[PDB]
Design a binder for these strands. Structure first.
Length: 103
DNA sequence: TATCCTAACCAAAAGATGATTTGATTGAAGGGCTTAAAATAGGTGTGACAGTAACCGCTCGCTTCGGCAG
């Protein structure tokens, strides 16, 4: 069960380029997405679809507190709560204006 | 420079503008009436009739069962 049997990618390979030596339909669709975004009018490193989630994940994921009293108990429940804003679009119903709080 | 404004333009939220599709309304017609009359021909149930029926504060008079009489 060693990883040499599974690691088609070497540890020194960047994720910014699609490996052409693949048979994946997913990577084919990814190539279709990337090819039409390489022109001077379309090439950029802007937001993909959203930014907030990773920014507030990496800012806190895997970190530990500076005080002992602020320690999460082992096995403590983590609850994800979405709080909607008072200013609703009142034009769309699929998506909502909300902020997600972890308690 | 690190960073920004926001003229003119690109990506996305929202904010809006007219053409088209679907939920909803209805105009007209199938239909099935009305009393008004005049008429012969009719069937019986039923609803009066009638009957029994039943159910639903003070002061006198009168009486008895023993304690001596005979």
């Amino acid at each position: 069960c060693g990883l040499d049997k599974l690691k088609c990618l070497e540890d020194g390979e960047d994720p910014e380029v699609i490996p052409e030596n693949t048979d994946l339909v997913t990577l084919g669709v990814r190539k279709r997405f990337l090819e039409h975004r390489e022109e001077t009018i379309t090439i950029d490193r802007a937001c993909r679809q959203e930014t907030f989630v990773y920014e507030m994940e990496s800012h806190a994921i895997g970190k530990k507190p500076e005080n002992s009293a602020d320690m999460i108990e082992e096995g403590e429940l983590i609850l994800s709560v979405n709080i909607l804003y008072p200013v609703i679009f009142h034009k769309h119903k699929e998506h909502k204006p909300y902020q997600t709080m972890l308690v």
